[PDB]
Each structure stands twice: as structure tokens, then as C-alpha cells.
PDB file of C-alpha atoms and ligand atoms in Angstrom:
ATOM      1  CA  UNK A   1     -13.821  46.235  56.642  1.00 26.92           C
ATOM      2  CA  UNK A   2     -10.321  47.120  55.478  1.00 29.92           C
ATOM      3  CA  UNK A   3      -9.763  50.872  55.495  1.00 32.97           C
ATOM      4  CA  UNK A   4      -7.026  53.166  54.208  1.00 27.73           C
ATOM      5  CA  UNK A   5      -6.345  56.900  53.988  1.00 30.06           C
ATOM      6  CA  UNK A   6      -4.040  59.240  52.086  1.00 27.72           C
ATOM      7  CA  UNK A   7      -3.035  62.851  52.676  1.00 29.72           C
ATOM      8  CA  UNK A   8      -2.140  64.565  49.391  1.00 32.82           C
ATOM      9  CA  UNK A   9       0.531  67.277  49.571  1.00 32.89           C
ATOM     10  CA  UNK A  10       2.629  69.096  46.995  1.00 33.00           C
ATOM     11  CA  UNK A  11       4.812  72.110  46.234  1.00 38.59           C
ATOM     12  CA  UNK A  12       1.862  74.483  45.825  1.00 40.03           C
ATOM     13  CA  UNK A  13      -1.750  74.882  47.047  1.00 42.86           C
ATOM     14  CA  UNK A  14      -2.921  71.379  46.165  1.00 40.66           C
ATOM     15  CA  UNK A  15      -3.884  69.305  49.173  1.00 41.19           C
ATOM     16  CA  UNK A  16      -6.512  66.745  50.055  1.00 41.92           C
ATOM     17  CA  UNK A  17      -7.590  63.767  52.110  1.00 41.98           C
ATOM     18  CA  UNK A  18      -8.737  60.594  50.368  1.00 45.72           C
ATOM     19  CA  UNK A  19     -10.345  57.632  52.137  1.00 45.74           C
ATOM     20  CA  UNK A  20     -10.576  54.003  51.029  1.00 44.68           C
ATOM     21  CA  UNK A  21     -12.871  51.234  52.251  1.00 44.32           C
ATOM     22  CA  UNK A  22     -13.200  47.639  51.079  1.00 43.67           C
ATOM     23  CA  UNK A  23     -15.798  45.412  52.744  1.00 46.17           C
ATOM     24  CA  UNK A  24     -14.575  42.119  51.271  1.00 45.48           C
ATOM     25  CA  UNK A  25     -11.354  41.065  49.585  1.00 42.58           C
ATOM     26  CA  UNK A  26     -12.865  40.309  46.173  1.00 44.76           C
ATOM     27  CA  UNK A  27     -15.149  43.328  46.359  1.00 43.21           C
ATOM     28  CA  UNK A  28     -14.980  46.942  45.153  1.00 43.74           C
ATOM     29  CA  UNK A  29     -13.001  49.633  46.946  1.00 43.21           C
ATOM     30  CA  UNK A  30     -14.876  52.808  47.814  1.00 45.60           C
ATOM     31  CA  UNK A  31     -12.703  55.892  47.377  1.00 48.45           C
ATOM     32  CA  UNK A  32     -13.905  59.249  48.664  1.00 46.06           C
ATOM     33  CA  UNK A  33     -12.729  62.632  49.901  1.00 43.59           C
ATOM     34  CA  UNK A  34     -11.803  65.991  48.454  1.00 45.90           C
ATOM     35  CA  UNK A  35      -8.873  67.813  46.912  1.00 45.34           C
ATOM     36  CA  UNK A  36      -8.383  71.568  47.042  1.00 43.47           C
ATOM     37  CA  UNK A  37      -6.122  74.031  45.222  1.00 43.06           C
ATOM     38  CA  UNK A  38      -6.803  72.673  41.726  1.00 41.79           C
ATOM     39  CA  UNK A  39      -7.534  74.434  38.466  1.00 44.29           C
ATOM     40  CA  UNK A  40     -11.219  74.158  37.535  1.00 46.01           C
ATOM     41  CA  UNK A  41     -11.823  71.071  35.396  1.00 46.02           C
ATOM     42  CA  UNK A  42     -10.372  67.579  34.941  1.00 44.33           C
ATOM     43  CA  UNK A  43      -7.313  66.090  36.671  1.00 40.31           C
ATOM     44  CA  UNK A  44      -5.692  62.660  36.369  1.00 40.54           C
ATOM     45  CA  UNK A  45      -5.974  60.596  39.544  1.00 40.47           C
ATOM     46  CA  UNK A  46      -3.687  57.557  39.806  1.00 39.25           C
ATOM     47  CA  UNK A  47      -2.000  55.122  42.121  1.00 38.49           C
ATOM     48  CA  UNK A  48       1.723  55.004  41.371  1.00 39.80           C
ATOM     49  CA  UNK A  49       3.936  52.052  42.179  1.00 38.67           C
ATOM     50  CA  UNK A  50       6.144  53.178  45.067  1.00 38.14           C
ATOM     51  CA  UNK A  51       5.271  54.736  48.416  1.00 38.80           C
ATOM     52  CA  UNK A  52       8.536  56.650  48.153  1.00 37.59           C
ATOM     53  CA  UNK A  53       8.181  60.369  48.840  1.00 36.29           C
ATOM     54  CA  UNK A  54      11.907  61.102  49.262  1.00 37.17           C
ATOM     55  CA  UNK A  55      11.757  63.346  46.180  1.00 39.23           C
ATOM     56  CA  UNK A  56       8.140  64.343  46.678  1.00 40.21           C
ATOM     57  CA  UNK A  57       5.955  62.953  43.911  1.00 40.43           C
ATOM     58  CA  UNK A  58       8.933  62.483  41.609  1.00 41.71           C
ATOM     59  CA  UNK A  59      10.035  59.304  43.404  1.00 40.80           C
ATOM     60  CA  UNK A  60       6.650  57.532  43.249  1.00 41.78           C
ATOM     61  CA  UNK A  61       7.575  55.689  40.056  1.00 40.63           C
ATOM     62  CA  UNK A  62       5.131  54.906  37.215  1.00 39.86           C
ATOM     63  CA  UNK A  63       1.432  54.096  37.275  1.00 39.92           C
ATOM     64  CA  UNK A  64       0.848  51.009  39.391  1.00 40.72           C
ATOM     65  CA  UNK A  65       0.314  48.036  37.098  1.00 40.64           C
ATOM     66  CA  UNK A  66       1.395  44.594  38.371  1.00 37.62           C
ATOM     67  CA  UNK A  67      -6.241  49.769  31.909  1.00 35.60           C
ATOM     68  CA  UNK A  68      -3.494  50.088  34.487  1.00 34.02           C
ATOM     69  CA  UNK A  69      -4.592  48.895  37.915  1.00 34.78           C
ATOM     70  CA  UNK A  70      -3.591  52.309  39.267  1.00 35.64           C
ATOM     71  CA  UNK A  71      -5.725  54.267  36.803  1.00 33.89           C
ATOM     72  CA  UNK A  72      -8.607  55.757  38.806  1.00 33.30           C
ATOM     73  CA  UNK A  73      -9.547  58.082  35.949  1.00 32.56           C
ATOM     74  CA  UNK A  74     -10.090  61.812  36.340  1.00 32.34           C
ATOM     75  CA  UNK A  75     -11.486  64.001  39.091  1.00 29.68           C
ATOM     76  CA  UNK A  76     -13.236  67.327  38.469  1.00 32.06           C
ATOM     77  CA  UNK A  77     -12.581  70.541  40.400  1.00 36.96           C
ATOM     78  CA  UNK A  78     -15.216  73.269  40.734  1.00 37.32           C
ATOM     79  CA  UNK A  79     -14.775  77.037  40.280  1.00 41.65           C
ATOM     80  CA  UNK A  80     -13.228  77.247  43.760  1.00 40.31           C
ATOM     81  CA  UNK A  81     -10.663  74.599  42.859  1.00 39.04           C
ATOM     82  CA  UNK A  82     -12.304  71.879  44.951  1.00 41.90           C
ATOM     83  CA  UNK A  83     -12.621  68.365  43.552  1.00 41.95           C
ATOM     84  CA  UNK A  84     -15.051  66.016  45.216  1.00 44.57           C
ATOM     85  CA  UNK A  85     -13.918  62.402  44.930  1.00 43.01           C
ATOM     86  CA  UNK A  86     -16.507  59.630  44.955  1.00 41.77           C
ATOM     87  CA  UNK A  87     -15.323  56.491  43.195  1.00 41.88           C
ATOM     88  CA  UNK A  88     -16.118  52.805  43.425  1.00 43.15           C
ATOM     89  CA  UNK A  89     -13.437  50.679  41.818  1.00 46.15           C
ATOM     90  CA  UNK A  90     -13.215  46.921  41.392  1.00 44.18           C
ATOM     91  CA  UNK A  91      -9.662  46.735  39.995  1.00 46.47           C
ATOM     92  CA  UNK A  92      -7.677  48.243  42.868  1.00 47.94           C
ATOM     93  CA  UNK A  93      -7.738  46.367  46.174  1.00 52.06           C
ATOM     94  CA  UNK A  94      -6.641  46.716  49.797  1.00 50.51           C
ATOM     95  CA  UNK A  95      -5.258  43.163  49.752  1.00 45.05           C
ATOM     96  CA  UNK A  96      -3.777  40.615  47.348  1.00 47.74           C
ATOM     97  CA  UNK A  97      -1.707  41.439  44.266  1.00 45.79           C
ATOM     98  CA  UNK A  98      -3.679  44.582  43.400  1.00 46.40           C
ATOM     99  CA  UNK A  99      -3.110  45.932  46.911  1.00 45.74           C
ATOM    100  CA  UNK A 100      -2.455  49.669  46.968  1.00 46.90           C
ATOM    101  CA  UNK A 101      -1.567  50.048  50.657  1.00 50.56           C
ATOM    102  CA  UNK A 102       1.929  51.518  50.899  1.00 45.47           C
ATOM    103  CA  UNK A 103       1.800  52.932  47.381  1.00 44.17           C
ATOM    104  CA  UNK A 104       1.373  56.552  46.280  1.00 44.73           C
ATOM    105  CA  UNK A 105      -1.797  58.354  45.238  1.00 45.68           C
ATOM    106  CA  UNK A 106      -1.092  61.180  42.761  1.00 48.43           C
ATOM    107  CA  UNK A 107      -3.271  63.949  41.346  1.00 48.61           C
ATOM    108  CA  UNK A 108      -2.083  65.380  38.032  1.00 51.04           C
ATOM    109  CA  UNK A 109      -1.991  68.752  36.279  1.00 51.56           C
ATOM    110  CA  UNK A 110      -4.017  67.575  33.275  1.00 55.51           C
ATOM    111  CA  UNK A 111      -6.681  65.026  32.370  1.00 59.72           C
ATOM    112  CA  UNK A 112      -5.888  61.554  31.022  1.00 59.62           C
ATOM    113  CA  UNK A 113      -1.425  63.791  32.521  1.00 62.12           C
ATOM    114  CA  UNK A 114       1.373  66.321  32.922  1.00 63.55           C
ATOM    115  CA  UNK A 115       3.019  67.225  36.203  1.00 66.43           C
ATOM    116  CA  UNK A 116       2.345  65.569  39.542  1.00 64.84           C
ATOM    117  CA  UNK A 117       0.721  68.319  41.608  1.00 66.36           C
ATOM    118  CA  UNK A 118       0.300  66.457  44.881  1.00 67.63           C
ATOM    119  CA  UNK A 119       0.700  62.991  46.337  1.00 64.80           C
ATOM    120  CA  UNK A 120       0.769  60.931  49.499  1.00 61.77           C
ATOM    121  CA  UNK A 121       1.483  57.412  50.695  1.00 62.88           C
ATOM    122  CA  UNK A 122      -1.618  55.247  51.182  1.00 61.92           C
ATOM    123  CA  UNK A 123      -1.812  54.130  54.807  1.00 58.82           C
ATOM    124  CA  UNK A 124      -3.851  51.785  56.980  1.00 59.51           C
ATOM    125  CA  UNK A 125      -6.705  53.668  58.659  1.00 62.45           C
ATOM    126  CA  UNK A 126      -8.961  53.193  61.673  1.00 60.91           C
TER     127      UNK A 126
ATOM    128  CA  UNK B   1       7.764  44.069  49.132  1.00 59.03           C
ATOM    129  CA  UNK B   2      11.417  43.593  50.066  1.00 61.33           C
ATOM    130  CA  UNK B   3      12.154  47.253  50.786  1.00 63.67           C
ATOM    131  CA  UNK B   4      10.254  50.103  52.392  1.00 61.33           C
ATOM    132  CA  UNK B   5      10.998  53.778  53.011  1.00 64.36           C
ATOM    133  CA  UNK B   6       9.664  56.500  55.285  1.00 63.72           C
ATOM    134  CA  UNK B   7      10.022  60.268  55.141  1.00 66.61           C
ATOM    135  CA  UNK B   8       9.706  61.725  58.644  1.00 66.65           C
ATOM    136  CA  UNK B   9       8.261  65.230  59.046  1.00 63.11           C
ATOM    137  CA  UNK B  10       6.563  67.177  61.828  1.00 65.20           C
ATOM    138  CA  UNK B  11       5.423  70.603  63.013  1.00 69.88           C
ATOM    139  CA  UNK B  12       8.983  71.445  64.019  1.00 68.85           C
ATOM    140  CA  UNK B  13      12.475  70.922  62.583  1.00 67.77           C
ATOM    141  CA  UNK B  14      12.693  67.131  62.938  1.00 67.86           C
ATOM    142  CA  UNK B  15      13.113  65.437  59.578  1.00 67.64           C
ATOM    143  CA  UNK B  16      14.594  62.230  58.289  1.00 72.88           C
ATOM    144  CA  UNK B  17      14.549  59.339  55.880  1.00 69.78           C
ATOM    145  CA  UNK B  18      14.454  55.759  57.125  1.00 68.03           C
ATOM    146  CA  UNK B  19      14.926  52.660  54.970  1.00 75.52           C
ATOM    147  CA  UNK B  20      13.721  49.127  55.685  1.00 73.26           C
ATOM    148  CA  UNK B  21      14.973  46.006  53.946  1.00 72.93           C
ATOM    149  CA  UNK B  22      13.769  42.433  54.300  1.00 75.46           C
ATOM    150  CA  UNK B  23      15.366  40.329  51.560  1.00 73.04           C
ATOM    151  CA  UNK B  24      13.951  37.081  52.970  1.00 71.44           C
ATOM    152  CA  UNK B  25      10.274  36.590  53.802  1.00 70.03           C
ATOM    153  CA  UNK B  26       9.790  36.443  57.584  1.00 67.84           C
ATOM    154  CA  UNK B  27      13.474  37.252  57.978  1.00 70.84           C
ATOM    155  CA  UNK B  28      15.215  40.025  59.927  1.00 71.01           C
ATOM    156  CA  UNK B  29      14.510  43.585  58.815  1.00 72.70           C
ATOM    157  CA  UNK B  30      17.413  46.005  58.417  1.00 72.70           C
ATOM    158  CA  UNK B  31      16.461  49.571  59.386  1.00 74.72           C
ATOM    159  CA  UNK B  32      18.743  52.497  58.566  1.00 76.06           C
ATOM    160  CA  UNK B  33      18.921  56.188  57.794  1.00 76.21           C
ATOM    161  CA  UNK B  34      19.336  59.538  59.463  1.00 75.84           C
ATOM    162  CA  UNK B  35      17.165  61.921  61.456  1.00 76.35           C
ATOM    163  CA  UNK B  36      18.089  65.551  62.114  1.00 79.36           C
ATOM    164  CA  UNK B  37      16.646  68.468  64.085  1.00 75.62           C
ATOM    165  CA  UNK B  38      16.669  66.512  67.346  1.00 74.35           C
ATOM    166  CA  UNK B  39      17.808  67.520  70.820  1.00 74.69           C
ATOM    167  CA  UNK B  40      21.040  65.764  71.799  1.00 75.29           C
ATOM    168  CA  UNK B  41      20.257  62.477  73.541  1.00 71.27           C
ATOM    169  CA  UNK B  42      17.850  59.533  73.385  1.00 72.76           C
ATOM    170  CA  UNK B  43      14.581  59.530  71.444  1.00 72.79           C
ATOM    171  CA  UNK B  44      11.883  56.869  71.333  1.00 70.36           C
ATOM    172  CA  UNK B  45      11.590  55.272  67.900  1.00 73.20           C
ATOM    173  CA  UNK B  46       8.338  53.413  67.206  1.00 74.03           C
ATOM    174  CA  UNK B  47       6.008  52.090  64.561  1.00 73.35           C
ATOM    175  CA  UNK B  48       2.480  53.304  65.312  1.00 71.78           C
ATOM    176  CA  UNK B  49      -0.666  51.546  64.181  1.00 73.85           C
ATOM    177  CA  UNK B  50      -2.152  53.781  61.518  1.00 74.12           C
ATOM    178  CA  UNK B  51      -0.667  55.310  58.382  1.00 72.91           C
ATOM    179  CA  UNK B  52      -2.992  58.255  58.978  1.00 70.05           C
ATOM    180  CA  UNK B  53      -1.407  61.702  58.690  1.00 70.97           C
ATOM    181  CA  UNK B  54      -4.684  63.638  58.465  1.00 70.46           C
ATOM    182  CA  UNK B  55      -3.848  65.397  61.739  1.00 68.97           C
ATOM    183  CA  UNK B  56      -0.085  65.141  61.504  1.00 68.04           C
ATOM    184  CA  UNK B  57       1.377  62.712  64.005  1.00 68.95           C
ATOM    185  CA  UNK B  58      -1.622  63.046  66.302  1.00 72.42           C
ATOM    186  CA  UNK B  59      -3.577  60.668  64.046  1.00 69.36           C
ATOM    187  CA  UNK B  60      -0.932  57.914  63.959  1.00 69.55           C
ATOM    188  CA  UNK B  61      -2.763  55.874  66.595  1.00 70.62           C
ATOM    189  CA  UNK B  62      -1.228  53.833  69.408  1.00 67.11           C
ATOM    190  CA  UNK B  63       2.150  52.117  69.482  1.00 65.84           C
ATOM    191  CA  UNK B  64       1.784  49.175  67.050  1.00 70.87           C
ATOM    192  CA  UNK B  65       1.036  46.036  69.042  1.00 74.52           C
ATOM    193  CA  UNK B  66      -1.447  43.641  67.459  1.00 77.82           C
ATOM    194  CA  UNK B  67      -3.265  41.401  69.931  1.00 76.96           C
ATOM    195  CA  UNK B  68      -2.793  38.856  67.126  1.00 76.20           C
ATOM    196  CA  UNK B  69       7.956  44.725  74.070  1.00 73.38           C
ATOM    197  CA  UNK B  70       5.413  46.134  71.617  1.00 70.93           C
ATOM    198  CA  UNK B  71       5.874  44.869  68.047  1.00 71.22           C
ATOM    199  CA  UNK B  72       6.389  48.472  66.948  1.00 70.93           C
ATOM    200  CA  UNK B  73       9.021  49.206  69.586  1.00 72.79           C
ATOM    201  CA  UNK B  74      12.320  49.778  67.783  1.00 73.98           C
ATOM    202  CA  UNK B  75      13.893  51.170  70.956  1.00 72.47           C
ATOM    203  CA  UNK B  76      15.626  54.542  71.147  1.00 71.50           C
ATOM    204  CA  UNK B  77      17.755  56.444  68.640  1.00 70.45           C
ATOM    205  CA  UNK B  78      20.635  58.663  69.790  1.00 70.83           C
ATOM    206  CA  UNK B  79      21.084  62.219  68.507  1.00 70.92           C
ATOM    207  CA  UNK B  80      24.553  63.784  68.636  1.00 69.76           C
ATOM    208  CA  UNK B  81      25.676  67.352  69.386  1.00 70.15           C
ATOM    209  CA  UNK B  82      24.487  68.525  65.961  1.00 69.35           C
ATOM    210  CA  UNK B  83      21.075  66.980  66.597  1.00 69.59           C
ATOM    211  CA  UNK B  84      21.614  64.149  64.116  1.00 68.49           C
ATOM    212  CA  UNK B  85      20.608  60.549  64.828  1.00 71.38           C
ATOM    213  CA  UNK B  86      22.245  57.937  62.623  1.00 68.63           C
ATOM    214  CA  UNK B  87      20.176  54.770  62.618  1.00 71.27           C
ATOM    215  CA  UNK B  88      21.327  51.243  61.842  1.00 72.74           C
ATOM    216  CA  UNK B  89      19.235  48.508  63.436  1.00 72.42           C
ATOM    217  CA  UNK B  90      18.346  44.902  62.738  1.00 70.84           C
ATOM    218  CA  UNK B  91      14.949  43.743  63.995  1.00 72.18           C
ATOM    219  CA  UNK B  92      13.357  40.299  63.826  1.00 73.02           C
ATOM    220  CA  UNK B  93       9.922  41.243  65.200  1.00 69.93           C
ATOM    221  CA  UNK B  94       8.689  43.776  62.648  1.00 71.49           C
ATOM    222  CA  UNK B  95       8.170  42.548  59.102  1.00 74.32           C
ATOM    223  CA  UNK B  96       7.283  43.772  55.607  1.00 72.31           C
ATOM    224  CA  UNK B  97       4.588  41.084  55.348  1.00 71.25           C
ATOM    225  CA  UNK B  98       2.197  39.045  57.463  1.00 70.81           C
ATOM    226  CA  UNK B  99       0.754  39.770  60.892  1.00 68.70           C
ATOM    227  CA  UNK B 100       3.591  42.083  61.914  1.00 68.43           C
ATOM    228  CA  UNK B 101       3.614  43.951  58.602  1.00 67.36           C
ATOM    229  CA  UNK B 102       4.487  47.637  58.980  1.00 68.44           C
ATOM    230  CA  UNK B 103       3.834  48.717  55.392  1.00 69.65           C
ATOM    231  CA  UNK B 104       1.195  51.456  55.445  1.00 69.68           C
ATOM    232  CA  UNK B 105       1.707  52.161  59.137  1.00 66.53           C
ATOM    233  CA  UNK B 106       3.485  55.144  60.693  1.00 65.89           C
ATOM    234  CA  UNK B 107       7.074  55.519  61.891  1.00 66.34           C
ATOM    235  CA  UNK B 108       7.389  58.010  64.766  1.00 66.16           C
ATOM    236  CA  UNK B 109      10.295  59.678  66.555  1.00 67.07           C
ATOM    237  CA  UNK B 110       9.524  60.923  70.063  1.00 70.58           C
ATOM    238  CA  UNK B 111      10.499  63.879  72.247  1.00 70.10           C
ATOM    239  CA  UNK B 112      11.977  61.696  74.999  1.00 70.25           C
ATOM    240  CA  UNK B 113      13.410  58.220  75.570  1.00 69.25           C
ATOM    241  CA  UNK B 114      11.085  55.413  76.628  1.00 71.13           C
ATOM    242  CA  UNK B 115       7.063  58.404  78.928  1.00 70.87           C
ATOM    243  CA  UNK B 116       8.320  59.097  75.387  1.00 70.95           C
ATOM    244  CA  UNK B 117       6.400  62.373  75.289  1.00 71.16           C
ATOM    245  CA  UNK B 118       5.363  64.153  72.106  1.00 73.29           C
ATOM    246  CA  UNK B 119       5.612  62.829  68.572  1.00 71.81           C
ATOM    247  CA  UNK B 120       8.171  65.131  66.967  1.00 67.46           C
ATOM    248  CA  UNK B 121       7.993  63.702  63.452  1.00 65.53           C
ATOM    249  CA  UNK B 122       6.358  60.867  61.549  1.00 64.61           C
ATOM    250  CA  UNK B 123       5.678  59.436  58.118  1.00 61.47           C
ATOM    251  CA  UNK B 124       3.757  56.648  56.433  1.00 62.51           C
ATOM    252  CA  UNK B 125       5.879  53.579  55.668  1.00 62.98           C
ATOM    253  CA  UNK B 126       5.756  52.995  51.924  1.00 59.18           C
ATOM    254  CA  UNK B 127       6.793  50.287  49.460  1.00 59.05           C
ATOM    255  CA  UNK B 128      10.247  51.097  48.010  1.00 58.63           C
ATOM    256  CA  UNK B 129      10.989  47.882  46.093  1.00 58.10           C
TER     257      UNK B 129
HETATM  258 ZN1   ZN C   1      -0.046  59.217  37.146  1.00 60.21          ZN
HETATM  259 ZN1   ZN C   2      -1.836  54.405  33.657  1.00 59.55          ZN
HETATM  260 ZN1   ZN C   3       5.459  55.789  70.254  1.00 62.40          ZN
END
């Protein structure tokens, strides 16, 4: 299976590790992990176009959209600020034109989204 | 992708930004930028297999060398008296597509010249254009 991973980092307490797995090229991508340091409640969760972190999350560009392909909806943080992520998505991919490897995963201040709290470049994983 | 970019960071003071450009598919890749916080001298400069920063550079995996010079071996960079390494390389082995694609993998700068010792800084190679 194709696998990817992303370490989310930002200016404040928000941080997380998100994993991706896709068993076949025309199949769904499993996305799972956790994000900490969030306000309790809903937060926008998107793939943005560029894997450019030269200005932190500011340089990631817009939502990836070759719904937007990059729109993975919202994640929910508990009372301790921890969001569990467990998503299966059939629009994103780890190959082809909807490929998100080398792009940026971003978690937002608000639900969908306000400021970009944390982000990371999506990389090939073992 | 015709351009990629990498922000190098580590546990210490080594930091940098490296650009990659490949205007023609399967063509030479231009690699350029600057790295600072280095000891004066030669430093190994490699693409490693995994774009996995979960444990900093320790999770970057081995030197990139698909069993279909390592593919990921971009040689050594030279830091000056101020600890700054200016990079301007052309490489025809790495690529931004295909079997030797380095998008989503990790760029690493080492403690020593290549035996290269610790990984001082690294970053995931991302799509820039
Ligand atoms: Zn967004
Ligand atoms: Zn969108
Ligand atoms: Zn190396």
C-alpha cells in the first residue's frame, strides 16, 4: 500500500501527526492520527496546494483543487484540546492528479475557516 | 510539479531553504539556496527515503536509493567562516517525477563530509509550483 505522513506544527501549542494509507490507486485514502493544542470543538482540516513552509502555513497557498479536493471537512477536539482524526476519503489520492504527496495539510482556527493554526508537508512514509 | 522547496530545521542551529527546479520532464534538476548554522567545512547533502519528520531527522530513513552513487547523493556542501553554505547544483539523477522522484522525501544536511555522521537538519521536500 502507498503510505504518507504529516507532522503538523505552528506558532502556538497546536501539533499533531497524521497518517495516510491507500491500498489501491482508485481506492479510498485512510487518514488517521491526532492533533493537540486545539480549542474544544470543530476545526477546518484541509489540504492546501503547495508544500511550501517557507512562511509557515502562510505560504501553503489555497485549498488544493486541481467540493474542493483538499476539503477533508472538520475535526473535533475534546475538552483537553485533543482531536482524534479518523477519516476515509475517496476524493484525495496518493497518486494521479488528486495526489496530495508534497502538499500541505492545514488545521484551522474555525469550522468550515479563519487562521491557519498548524501545518506540515505531506511526505512518503514507511 | 516543476518546482519544489524544502525548509531545513533540526534540534540545533542549522537551518536553510533549498529550491529545486525541473522545467523539463526527466531533465536536469537545478538545486539552490542557503544553509546556515554549520561548522566551517564540508557537509554531506542527501535526499533520504521518507518524508517522515515524526521523530525529527531520525525518522527520515536511509539514503534514498531505490533498487528500481546513491540516487539521493547530492554530494557535499561547503560552509564558510560564518557557517553559511551557499548551494547551487545541477543534478541529472534526481527528478521531480518518476522513479527517482524526490517530492515528499526528506532533504538532509549532515555533520560531516561523506561516515557523514549525524543529521543536523532536514525537511520534507514539497511542491512549490
Ligand atoms: Zn484551508
Ligand atoms: Zn475548500
Ligand atoms: Zn545521508
